[PDB]
Every structure is written in C-alpha cells, then in structure tokens.
PDB file of C-alpha atoms in Angstrom:
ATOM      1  CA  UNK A   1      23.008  -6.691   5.602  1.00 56.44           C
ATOM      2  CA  UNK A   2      21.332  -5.755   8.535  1.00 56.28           C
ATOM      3  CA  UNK A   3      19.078  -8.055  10.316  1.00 55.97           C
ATOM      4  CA  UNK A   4      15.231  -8.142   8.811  1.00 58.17           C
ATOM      5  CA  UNK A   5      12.432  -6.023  10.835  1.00 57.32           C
ATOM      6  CA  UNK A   6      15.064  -4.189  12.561  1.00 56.93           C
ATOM      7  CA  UNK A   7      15.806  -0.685  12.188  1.00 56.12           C
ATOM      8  CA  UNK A   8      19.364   0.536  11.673  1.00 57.07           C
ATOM      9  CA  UNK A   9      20.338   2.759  14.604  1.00 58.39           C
ATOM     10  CA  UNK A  10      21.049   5.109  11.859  1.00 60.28           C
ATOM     11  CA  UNK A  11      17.095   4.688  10.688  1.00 60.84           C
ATOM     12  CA  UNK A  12      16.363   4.975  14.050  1.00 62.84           C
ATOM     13  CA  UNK A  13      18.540   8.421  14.311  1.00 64.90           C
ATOM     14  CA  UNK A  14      16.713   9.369  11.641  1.00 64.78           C
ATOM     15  CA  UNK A  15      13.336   9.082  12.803  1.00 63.61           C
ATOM     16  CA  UNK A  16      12.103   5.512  11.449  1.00 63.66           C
ATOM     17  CA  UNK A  17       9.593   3.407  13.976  1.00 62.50           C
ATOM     18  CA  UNK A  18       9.180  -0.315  12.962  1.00 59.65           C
ATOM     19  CA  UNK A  19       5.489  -0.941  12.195  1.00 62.69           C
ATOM     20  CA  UNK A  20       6.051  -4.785  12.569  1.00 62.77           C
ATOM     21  CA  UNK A  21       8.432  -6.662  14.646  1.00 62.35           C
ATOM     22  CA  UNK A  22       8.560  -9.953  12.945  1.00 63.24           C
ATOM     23  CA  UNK A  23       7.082 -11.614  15.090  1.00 63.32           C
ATOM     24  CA  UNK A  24       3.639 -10.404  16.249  1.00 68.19           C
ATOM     25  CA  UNK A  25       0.575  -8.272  14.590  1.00 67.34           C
ATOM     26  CA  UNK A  26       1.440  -5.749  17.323  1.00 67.30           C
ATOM     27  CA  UNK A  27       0.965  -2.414  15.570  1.00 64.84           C
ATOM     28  CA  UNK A  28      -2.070  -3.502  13.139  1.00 62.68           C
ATOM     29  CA  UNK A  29      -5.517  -4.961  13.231  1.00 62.35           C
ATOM     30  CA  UNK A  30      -8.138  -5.249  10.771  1.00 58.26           C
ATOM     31  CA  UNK A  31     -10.063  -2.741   8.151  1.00 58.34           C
ATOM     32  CA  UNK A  32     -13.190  -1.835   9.803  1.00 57.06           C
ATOM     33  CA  UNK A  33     -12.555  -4.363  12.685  1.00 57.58           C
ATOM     34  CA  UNK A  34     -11.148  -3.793  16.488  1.00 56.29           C
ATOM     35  CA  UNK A  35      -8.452  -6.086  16.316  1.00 59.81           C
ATOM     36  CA  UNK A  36      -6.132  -8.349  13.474  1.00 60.92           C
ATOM     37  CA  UNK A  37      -7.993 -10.849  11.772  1.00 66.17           C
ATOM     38  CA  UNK A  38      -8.540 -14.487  13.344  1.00 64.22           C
ATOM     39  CA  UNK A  39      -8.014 -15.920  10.135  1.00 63.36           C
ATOM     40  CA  UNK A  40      -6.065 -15.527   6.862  1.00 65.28           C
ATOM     41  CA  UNK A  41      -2.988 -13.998   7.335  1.00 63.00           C
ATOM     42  CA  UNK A  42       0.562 -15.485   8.815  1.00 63.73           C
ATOM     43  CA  UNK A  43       3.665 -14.670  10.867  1.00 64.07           C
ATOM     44  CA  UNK A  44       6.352 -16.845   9.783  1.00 61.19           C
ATOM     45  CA  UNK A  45      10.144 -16.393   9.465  1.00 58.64           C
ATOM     46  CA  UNK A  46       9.858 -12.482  10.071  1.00 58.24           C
ATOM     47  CA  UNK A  47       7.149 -12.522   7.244  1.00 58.28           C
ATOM     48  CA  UNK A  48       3.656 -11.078   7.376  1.00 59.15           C
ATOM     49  CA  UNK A  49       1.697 -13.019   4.687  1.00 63.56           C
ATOM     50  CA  UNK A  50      -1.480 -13.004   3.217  1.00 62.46           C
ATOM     51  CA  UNK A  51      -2.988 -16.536   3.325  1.00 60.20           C
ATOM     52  CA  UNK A  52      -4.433 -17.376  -0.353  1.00 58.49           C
ATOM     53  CA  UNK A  53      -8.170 -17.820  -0.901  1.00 60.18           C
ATOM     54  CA  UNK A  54      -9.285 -21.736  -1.114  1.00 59.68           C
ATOM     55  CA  UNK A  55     -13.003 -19.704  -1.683  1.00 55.38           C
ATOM     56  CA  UNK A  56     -13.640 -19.875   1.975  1.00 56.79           C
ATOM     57  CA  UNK A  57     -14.010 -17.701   4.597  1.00 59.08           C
ATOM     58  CA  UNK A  58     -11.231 -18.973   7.059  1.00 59.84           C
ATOM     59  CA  UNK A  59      -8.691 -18.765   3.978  1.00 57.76           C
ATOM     60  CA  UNK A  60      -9.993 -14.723   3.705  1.00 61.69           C
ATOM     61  CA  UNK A  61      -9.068 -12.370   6.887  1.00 63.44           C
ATOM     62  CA  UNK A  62      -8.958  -9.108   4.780  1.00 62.48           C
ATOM     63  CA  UNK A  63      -7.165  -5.969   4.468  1.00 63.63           C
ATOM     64  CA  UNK A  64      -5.034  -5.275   7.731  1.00 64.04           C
ATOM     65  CA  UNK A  65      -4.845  -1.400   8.644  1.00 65.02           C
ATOM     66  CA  UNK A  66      -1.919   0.376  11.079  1.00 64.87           C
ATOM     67  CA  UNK A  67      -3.740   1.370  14.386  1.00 65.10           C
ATOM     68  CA  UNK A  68      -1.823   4.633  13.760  1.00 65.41           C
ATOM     69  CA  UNK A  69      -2.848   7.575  11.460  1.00 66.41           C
ATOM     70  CA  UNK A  70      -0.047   9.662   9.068  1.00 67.49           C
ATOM     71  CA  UNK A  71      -0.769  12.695   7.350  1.00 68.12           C
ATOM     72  CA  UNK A  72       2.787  13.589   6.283  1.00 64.41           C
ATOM     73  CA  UNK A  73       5.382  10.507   6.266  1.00 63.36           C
ATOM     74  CA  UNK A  74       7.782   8.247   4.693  1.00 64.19           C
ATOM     75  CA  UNK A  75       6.313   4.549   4.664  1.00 62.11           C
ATOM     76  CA  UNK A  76       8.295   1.171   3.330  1.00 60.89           C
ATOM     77  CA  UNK A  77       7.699  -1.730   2.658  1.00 56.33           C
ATOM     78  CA  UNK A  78       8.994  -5.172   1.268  1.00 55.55           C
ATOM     79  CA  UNK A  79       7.269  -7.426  -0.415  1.00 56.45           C
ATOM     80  CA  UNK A  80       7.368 -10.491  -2.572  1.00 55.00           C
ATOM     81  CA  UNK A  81       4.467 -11.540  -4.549  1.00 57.67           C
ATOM     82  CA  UNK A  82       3.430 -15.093  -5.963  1.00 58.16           C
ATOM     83  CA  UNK A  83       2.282 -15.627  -9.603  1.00 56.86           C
ATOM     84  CA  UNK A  84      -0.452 -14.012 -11.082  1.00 58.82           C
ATOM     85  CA  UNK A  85      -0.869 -12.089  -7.364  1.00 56.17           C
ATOM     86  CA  UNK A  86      -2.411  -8.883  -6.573  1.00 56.55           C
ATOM     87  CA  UNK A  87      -1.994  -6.792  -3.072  1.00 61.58           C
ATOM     88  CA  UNK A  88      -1.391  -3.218  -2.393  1.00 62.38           C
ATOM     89  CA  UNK A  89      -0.342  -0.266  -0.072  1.00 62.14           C
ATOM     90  CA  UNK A  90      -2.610   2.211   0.935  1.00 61.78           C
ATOM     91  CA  UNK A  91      -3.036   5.347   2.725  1.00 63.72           C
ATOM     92  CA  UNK A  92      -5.085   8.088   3.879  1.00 64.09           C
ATOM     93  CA  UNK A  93      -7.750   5.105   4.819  1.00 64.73           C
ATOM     94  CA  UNK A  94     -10.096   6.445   6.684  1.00 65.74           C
ATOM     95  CA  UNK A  95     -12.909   3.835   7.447  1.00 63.41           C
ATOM     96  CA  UNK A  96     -15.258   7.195   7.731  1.00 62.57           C
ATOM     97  CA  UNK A  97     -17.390   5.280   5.330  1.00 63.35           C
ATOM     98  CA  UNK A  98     -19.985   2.259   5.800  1.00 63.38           C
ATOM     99  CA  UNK A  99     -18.335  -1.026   7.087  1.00 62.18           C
ATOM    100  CA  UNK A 100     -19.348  -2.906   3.423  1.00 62.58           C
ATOM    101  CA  UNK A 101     -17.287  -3.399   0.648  1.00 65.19           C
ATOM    102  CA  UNK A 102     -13.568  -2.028   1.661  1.00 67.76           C
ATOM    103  CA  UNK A 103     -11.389   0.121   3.581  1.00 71.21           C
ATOM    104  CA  UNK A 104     -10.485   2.819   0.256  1.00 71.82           C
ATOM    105  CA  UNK A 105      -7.907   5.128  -0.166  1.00 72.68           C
ATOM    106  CA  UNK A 106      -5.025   6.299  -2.452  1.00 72.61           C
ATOM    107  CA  UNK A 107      -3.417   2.857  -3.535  1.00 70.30           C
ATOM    108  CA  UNK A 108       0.722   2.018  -4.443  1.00 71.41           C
ATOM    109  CA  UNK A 109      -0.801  -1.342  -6.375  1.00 71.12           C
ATOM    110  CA  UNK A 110       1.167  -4.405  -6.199  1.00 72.41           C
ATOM    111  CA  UNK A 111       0.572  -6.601  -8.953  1.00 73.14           C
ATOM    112  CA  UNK A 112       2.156  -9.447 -11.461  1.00 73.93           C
ATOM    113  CA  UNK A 113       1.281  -7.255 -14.680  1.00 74.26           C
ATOM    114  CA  UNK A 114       2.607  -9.888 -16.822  1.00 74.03           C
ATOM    115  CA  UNK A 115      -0.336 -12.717 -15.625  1.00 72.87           C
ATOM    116  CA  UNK A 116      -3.030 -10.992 -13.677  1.00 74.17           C
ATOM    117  CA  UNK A 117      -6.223  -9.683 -16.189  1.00 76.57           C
ATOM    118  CA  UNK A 118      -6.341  -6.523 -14.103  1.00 79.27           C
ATOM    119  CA  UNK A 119      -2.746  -5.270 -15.485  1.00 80.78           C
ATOM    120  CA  UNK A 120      -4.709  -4.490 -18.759  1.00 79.69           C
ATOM    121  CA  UNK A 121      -7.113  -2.570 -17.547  1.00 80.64           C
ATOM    122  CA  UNK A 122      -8.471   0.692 -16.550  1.00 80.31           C
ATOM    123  CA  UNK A 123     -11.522   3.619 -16.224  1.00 80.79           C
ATOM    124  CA  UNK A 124      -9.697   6.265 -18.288  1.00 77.05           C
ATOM    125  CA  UNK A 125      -6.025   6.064 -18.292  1.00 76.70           C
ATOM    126  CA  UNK A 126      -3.500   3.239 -19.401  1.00 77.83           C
ATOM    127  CA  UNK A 127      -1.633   1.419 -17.326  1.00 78.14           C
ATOM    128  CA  UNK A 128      -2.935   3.181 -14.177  1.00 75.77           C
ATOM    129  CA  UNK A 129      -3.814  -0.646 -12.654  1.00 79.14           C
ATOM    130  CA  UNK A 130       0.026  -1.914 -13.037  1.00 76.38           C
ATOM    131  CA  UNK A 131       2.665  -2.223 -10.417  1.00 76.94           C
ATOM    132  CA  UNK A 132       3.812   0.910  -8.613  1.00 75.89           C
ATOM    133  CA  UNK A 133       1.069   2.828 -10.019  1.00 74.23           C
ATOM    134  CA  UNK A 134      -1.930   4.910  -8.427  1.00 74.24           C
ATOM    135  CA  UNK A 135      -4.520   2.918  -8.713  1.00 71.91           C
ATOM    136  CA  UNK A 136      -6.813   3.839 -11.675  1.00 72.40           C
ATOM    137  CA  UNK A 137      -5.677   7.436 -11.785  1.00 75.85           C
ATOM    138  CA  UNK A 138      -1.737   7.392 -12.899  1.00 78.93           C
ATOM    139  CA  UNK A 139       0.629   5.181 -14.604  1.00 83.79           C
ATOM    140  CA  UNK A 140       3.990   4.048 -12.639  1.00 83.50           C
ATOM    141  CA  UNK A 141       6.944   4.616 -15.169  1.00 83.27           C
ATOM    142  CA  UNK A 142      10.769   3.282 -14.568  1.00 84.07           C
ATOM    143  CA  UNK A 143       9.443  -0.054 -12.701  1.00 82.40           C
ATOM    144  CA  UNK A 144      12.989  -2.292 -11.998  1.00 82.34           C
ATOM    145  CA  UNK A 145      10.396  -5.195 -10.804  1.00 87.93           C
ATOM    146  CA  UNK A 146      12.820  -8.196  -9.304  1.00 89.40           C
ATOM    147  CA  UNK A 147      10.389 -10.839 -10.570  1.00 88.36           C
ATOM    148  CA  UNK A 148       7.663 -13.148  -9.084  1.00 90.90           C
ATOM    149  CA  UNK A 149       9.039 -14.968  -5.880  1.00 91.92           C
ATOM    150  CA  UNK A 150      11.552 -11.958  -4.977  1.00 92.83           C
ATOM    151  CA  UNK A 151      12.126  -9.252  -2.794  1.00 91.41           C
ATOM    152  CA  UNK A 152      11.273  -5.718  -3.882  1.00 91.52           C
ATOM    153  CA  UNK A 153      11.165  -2.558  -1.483  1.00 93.49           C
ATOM    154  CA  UNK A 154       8.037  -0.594  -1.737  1.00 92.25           C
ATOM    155  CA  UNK A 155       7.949   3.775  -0.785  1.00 90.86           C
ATOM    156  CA  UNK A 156       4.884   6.084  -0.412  1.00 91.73           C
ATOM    157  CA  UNK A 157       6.516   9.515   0.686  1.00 92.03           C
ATOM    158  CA  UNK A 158       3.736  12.508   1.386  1.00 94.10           C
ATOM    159  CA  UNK A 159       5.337  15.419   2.371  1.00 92.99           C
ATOM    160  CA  UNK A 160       4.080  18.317   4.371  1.00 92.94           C
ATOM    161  CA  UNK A 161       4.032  19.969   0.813  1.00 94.03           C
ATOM    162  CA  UNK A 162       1.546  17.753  -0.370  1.00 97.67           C
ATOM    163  CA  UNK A 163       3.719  16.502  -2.661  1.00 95.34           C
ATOM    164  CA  UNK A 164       3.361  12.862  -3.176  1.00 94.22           C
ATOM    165  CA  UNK A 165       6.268  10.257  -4.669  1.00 95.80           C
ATOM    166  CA  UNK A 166       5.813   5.973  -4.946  1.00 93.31           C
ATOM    167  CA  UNK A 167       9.068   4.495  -5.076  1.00 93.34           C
ATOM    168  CA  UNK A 168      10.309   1.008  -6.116  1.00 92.80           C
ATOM    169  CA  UNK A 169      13.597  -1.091  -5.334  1.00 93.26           C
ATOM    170  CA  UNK A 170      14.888   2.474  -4.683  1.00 94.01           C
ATOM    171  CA  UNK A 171      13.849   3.787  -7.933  1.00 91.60           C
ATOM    172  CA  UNK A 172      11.096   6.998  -7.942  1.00 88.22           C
ATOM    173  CA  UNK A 173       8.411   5.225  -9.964  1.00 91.77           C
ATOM    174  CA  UNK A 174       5.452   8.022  -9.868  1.00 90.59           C
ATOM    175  CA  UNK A 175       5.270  11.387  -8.564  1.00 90.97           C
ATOM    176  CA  UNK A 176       1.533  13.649  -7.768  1.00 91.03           C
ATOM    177  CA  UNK A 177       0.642  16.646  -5.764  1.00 89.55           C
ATOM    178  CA  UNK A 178      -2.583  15.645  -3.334  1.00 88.60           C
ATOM    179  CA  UNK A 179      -5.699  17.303  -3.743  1.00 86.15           C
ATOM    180  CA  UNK A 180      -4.554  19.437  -6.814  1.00 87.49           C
ATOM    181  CA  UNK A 181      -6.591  20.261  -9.789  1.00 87.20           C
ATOM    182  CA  UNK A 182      -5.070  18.289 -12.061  1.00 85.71           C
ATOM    183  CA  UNK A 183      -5.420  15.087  -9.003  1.00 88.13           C
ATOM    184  CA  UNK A 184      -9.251  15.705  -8.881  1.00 87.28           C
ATOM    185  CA  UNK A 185      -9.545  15.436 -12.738  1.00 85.23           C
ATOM    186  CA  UNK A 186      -7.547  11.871 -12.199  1.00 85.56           C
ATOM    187  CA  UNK A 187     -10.155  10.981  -9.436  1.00 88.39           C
ATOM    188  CA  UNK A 188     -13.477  11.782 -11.941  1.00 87.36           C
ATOM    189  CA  UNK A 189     -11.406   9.969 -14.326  1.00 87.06           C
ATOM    190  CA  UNK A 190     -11.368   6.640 -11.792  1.00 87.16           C
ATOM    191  CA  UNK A 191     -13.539   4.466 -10.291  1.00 88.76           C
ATOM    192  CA  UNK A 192     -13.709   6.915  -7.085  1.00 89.04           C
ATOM    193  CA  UNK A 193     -15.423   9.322  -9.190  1.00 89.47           C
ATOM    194  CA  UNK A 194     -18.657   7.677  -7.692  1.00 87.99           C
ATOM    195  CA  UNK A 195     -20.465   9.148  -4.947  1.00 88.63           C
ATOM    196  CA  UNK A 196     -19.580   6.214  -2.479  1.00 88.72           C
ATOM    197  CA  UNK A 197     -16.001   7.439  -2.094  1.00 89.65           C
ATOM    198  CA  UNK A 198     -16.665  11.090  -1.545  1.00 90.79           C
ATOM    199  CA  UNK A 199     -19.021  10.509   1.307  1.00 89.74           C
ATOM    200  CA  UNK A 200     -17.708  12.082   4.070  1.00 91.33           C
ATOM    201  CA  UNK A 201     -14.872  14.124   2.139  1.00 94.36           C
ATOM    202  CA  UNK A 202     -12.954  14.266  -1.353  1.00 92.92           C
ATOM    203  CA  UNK A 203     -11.699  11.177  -2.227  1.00 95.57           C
ATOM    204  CA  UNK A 204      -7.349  10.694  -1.144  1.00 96.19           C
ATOM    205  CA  UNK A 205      -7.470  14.106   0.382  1.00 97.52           C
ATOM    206  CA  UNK A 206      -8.486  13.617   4.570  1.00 98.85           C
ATOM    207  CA  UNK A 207      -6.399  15.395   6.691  1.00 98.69           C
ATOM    208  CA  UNK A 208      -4.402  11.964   7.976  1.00102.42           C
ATOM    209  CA  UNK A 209      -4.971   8.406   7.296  1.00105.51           C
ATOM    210  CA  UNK A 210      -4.665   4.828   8.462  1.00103.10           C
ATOM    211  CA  UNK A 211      -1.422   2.754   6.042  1.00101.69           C
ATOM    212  CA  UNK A 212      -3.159  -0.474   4.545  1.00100.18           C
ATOM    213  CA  UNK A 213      -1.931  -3.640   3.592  1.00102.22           C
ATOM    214  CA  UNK A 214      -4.312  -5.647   0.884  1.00103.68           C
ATOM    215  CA  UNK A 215      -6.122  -8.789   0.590  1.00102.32           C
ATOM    216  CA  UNK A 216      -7.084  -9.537  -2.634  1.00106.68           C
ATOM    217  CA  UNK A 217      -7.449 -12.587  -2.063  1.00105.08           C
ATOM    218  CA  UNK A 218      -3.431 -14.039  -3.587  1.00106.22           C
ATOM    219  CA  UNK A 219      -0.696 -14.803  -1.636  1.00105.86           C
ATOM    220  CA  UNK A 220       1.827 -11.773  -0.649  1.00103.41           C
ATOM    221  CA  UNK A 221       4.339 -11.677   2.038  1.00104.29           C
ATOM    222  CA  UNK A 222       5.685  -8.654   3.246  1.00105.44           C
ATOM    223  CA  UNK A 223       8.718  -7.548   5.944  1.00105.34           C
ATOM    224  CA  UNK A 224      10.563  -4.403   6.805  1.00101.45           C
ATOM    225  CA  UNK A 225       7.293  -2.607   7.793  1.00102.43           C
ATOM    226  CA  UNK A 226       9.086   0.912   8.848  1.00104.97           C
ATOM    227  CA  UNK A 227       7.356   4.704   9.025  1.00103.05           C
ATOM    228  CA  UNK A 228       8.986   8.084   9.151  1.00103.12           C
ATOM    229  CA  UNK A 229       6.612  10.675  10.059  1.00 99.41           C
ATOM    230  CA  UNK A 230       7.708  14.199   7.970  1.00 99.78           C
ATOM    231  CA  UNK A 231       7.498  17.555  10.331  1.00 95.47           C
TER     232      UNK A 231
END
C-alpha cells in the first residue's frame, strides 16, 4: 500500500496532481468565499473532515470548492461516512449564481441509503438521491458500498467526449453524456428544472467547473484528493 495523500510516481507519470496534501487546505477554500472556512471542517491524520452540526454556526463551515476549474478530467476521492450521513462530490460549480443558498452543480451523492430519509426520495425518478447516483436525475446501479465507518474510493470521469462515468470502489456505478437531449429531459425532471439553476447557463453544462466537497451538515472524512485533467 502506498502511503495516503501521496501520488504513486506511476500516478504521477500518468498525469495525477494531489488536490490535498494531508496536511493543509492548500488547494481549496470555501463555496462563494475567498478562502477555506474558519470553522467546521478538520485536518487530522491525513483526513479532511467535515465537522458535524451541534445546530450552530461554528459547528457549520460549508461546502469547500477546489480553487482550480476542470472541464475534462478524472477526479477521486476517498471517503468514509458516519451513520445516517450525507455529503457529496460535485462539479462543474460555477458560483455564477447569487451567493444564497449553495454552490450547485452536477452531484456524485454520498449517502447512508439504508438510514438517511433522503435515500427514499426523489422529483421524478427512483433512486436518483442514493449513493453513487446523479443527484435527482439518474439512479447509480452495481453499488459494492464497504459499509458505514469504511473506506470507499469515489470517480467522476468527464471526458473531452462529453461522456460522463461515476465510479465506486473501482466499480463503474453510472454512466451519462453532458448536455444531451436525453440529460436535459433528466434536468426538467429534477429539482434544477427551476429557473434559479439556469440563470446564467443550462444547468451541469458550463464550459469548466470548480470540484466540490459537501456539507450537509453530517460528519464525512475524506483523503486521496487526486485530479487528472483529460486532453
């Protein structure tokens, strides 16, 4: 096993940057904000983790985005999730929107389907809220989840193609072509249907996009933070 939030020298050879370097928030900072949160988020033990919400604000720092942009690329992740805990990976986040609410985009959700009440549900299509999925557009299938309190190794590959694939523990999970017809009728069939995600552009489909790690408010801890951009 190689040492964690390092890359390979073969990763490296292959054209892999390390996004975090176990140590420091060098590399991110937060949605809609010039710098990484003050509060609610840790660097311990070559973890970046989302502090839990006690209800107040110094327990809440919010979603943390890469100060980099990727248009086509191979991101990963791991993560390891607590009970009943939500998170998620997104990209093309472009915070070309107003500051309120959240930094959107095109979501790889991370979720405990068996305990939170948001595993259940959805606008228009079933199990589009579940683990590995698109958020509220398309259902992850062949999800070999490693269980609450483990390790799993999240992918979002967008190729120059367009051509989009989420991957999990090294399985392909869910597979979609960006900006396609059949993609737009999955967007007026989700909750970004509404006008305050197409402001500014067609929701998921901006040229490039800040990577986004999710606070929702649970405890998630993530390592291995590593990008590939595609040429």
């Amino acid at each position: 096993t190689p040492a964690i939030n390092q890359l390979t020298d073969q990763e490296k050879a292959e054209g892999w940057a390390l996004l975090f370097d176990g140590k420091t928030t060098k590399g991110w900072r937060g949605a809609h904000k010039d710098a990484f949160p003050d509060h609610g988020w840790m660097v311990k033990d070559g973890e970046l983790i989302v502090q839990k919400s006690d209800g107040s604000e110094s327990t809440n720092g919010g979603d943390i985005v890469t100060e980099g942009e990727y248009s086509a690329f191979e991101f990963s992740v791991d993560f390891k999730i607590t009970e009943g805990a939500n998170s998620g990976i997104k990209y093309f986040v472009t915070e070309q929107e107003k500051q309120k609410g959240s930094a959107y985009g095109l979501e790889f959700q991370l979720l405990d389907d068996a305990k939170h009440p948001d595993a259940k549900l959805y606008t228009t299509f079933p199990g589009s809220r579940t683990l590995g999925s698109l958020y509220d557009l398309k259902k992850s299938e062949n999800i070999h989840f490693n269980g609450v309190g483990e390790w799993n190794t999240a992918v979002v590959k967008v190729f120059p193609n367009n051509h989009v694939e989420h991957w999990l523990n090294g399985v392909k999970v869910l597979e979609y072509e960006r900006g396609s017809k059949e993609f737009r009728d999955l967007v007026k069939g989700s909750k970004y249907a509404d006008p305050s995600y197409n402001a500014g552009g067609a929701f998921g489909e901006a040229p490039k996009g800040h990577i986004l790690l999710q606070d929702h408010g649970d405890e998630v801890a993530f390592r291995n933070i590593k990008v590939k951009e595609l040429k």
